[PDB]
Amino acid sequence: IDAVDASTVKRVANKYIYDKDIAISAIGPIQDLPDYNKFRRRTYWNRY
Amino acid sequence: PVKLKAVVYALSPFQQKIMTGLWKDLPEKIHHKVSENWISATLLVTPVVGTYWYAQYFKEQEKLEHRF
């Protein structure tokens, strides 16, 4: 655990989170939930 | 807001082929287009073509009759 520093978190996050595909499971009054492309786009920041 | 009950399954755009479906089932696509739209195509082409060929025929008869 102590080995996981800030640089470690960023490295692991870039491997598993950045510009990666996602799975979505929603139930109920979910018309206002953004679609797959909106969630997909929000996996990267274009200002960096 | 309309109350809607449904289940939707969707696939990621990066897990499917994007362009090959343009040329899939082409004979059906050509058959459907012709079989539903031939009357529409006839109602649009026949009066413009019938009027055009009549005017050309009229001008040919009018020119020849004025000759000597």
UniProtKB/Swiss-Prot annotation, chain A:
Record's protein name: Probable mitochondrial-processing peptidase subunit beta, mitochondrial
Family (UniProt): Belongs to the peptidase M16 family.
Compartments reported by the entry: Mitochondrion; Mitochondrion inner membrane
Disulfide bonds: none
Function in brief: Catalytic subunit of the essential mitochondrial processing protease (MPP), which cleaves the mitochondrial sequence off newly imported precursors proteins. Preferentially, cleaves after an arginine at position P2.
Whole sequence portion shown: 484 to 531 of 531
Subunit-level organization: Heterodimer of an alpha subunit and a beta subunit subunits, forming the mitochondrial processing protease (MPP) in which the alpha subunit is involved in substrate recognition and binding and the beta subunit is the catalytic subunit. Component of the ubiquinol-cytochrome c oxidoreductase (cytochrome b-c1 complex, complex III, CIII), a multisubunit enzyme composed of 10 subunits.
Source species, domain of life: Eukaryota
Swiss-Prot record, chain B:
Membrane-protein topology: Single-pass membrane protein
Membrane topology (Mitochondrial matrix): 1-37
Keyword field contains Electron transport: yes
Subcellular location: Mitochondrion inner membrane
Signal peptide range: none
Mitochondrial intermembrane side: 55-68
Highest taxon listed in the record's lineage: Eukaryota
Key words of the record: Electron transport, Membrane, Mitochondrion, Mitochondrion inner membrane, Respiratory chain, Transmembrane, Transmembrane helix, Transport, Ubiquinone
Pfam families: Cyt_b-c1_8
Keyword Signal: no
Example of a GO biological process term: mitochondrial electron transport, ubiquinol to cytochrome c
One cellular-component annotation, GO: mitochondrial inner membrane
Ranges annotated as spanning the membrane: 38-54
Task performed by this protein: Component of the ubiquinol-cytochrome c oxidoreductase, a multisubunit transmembrane complex that is part of the mitochondrial electron transport chain which drives oxidative phosphorylation.
Similarity comment: Belongs to the UQCRQ/QCR8 family.
Quaternary structure and interacting proteins, as annotated: Component of the ubiquinol-cytochrome c oxidoreductase (cytochrome b-c1 complex, complex III, CIII), a multisubunit enzyme composed of 10 subunits. The complex is composed of 3 respiratory subunits cytochrome b (MT-CYB), cytochrome c1 (CYC1-1 or CYC1-2) and Rieske protein (UCR1-1 or UCR1-2), 2 core protein subunits MPPalpha1 (or MPPalpha2) and MPPB, and 5 low-molecular weight protein subunits QCR7-1 (or QCR7-2), UCRQ-1 (or UCRQ-2), QCR9, UCRY and probably QCR6-1 (or QCR6-2).
Name of the protein: Cytochrome b-c1 complex subunit 8-1, mitochondrial
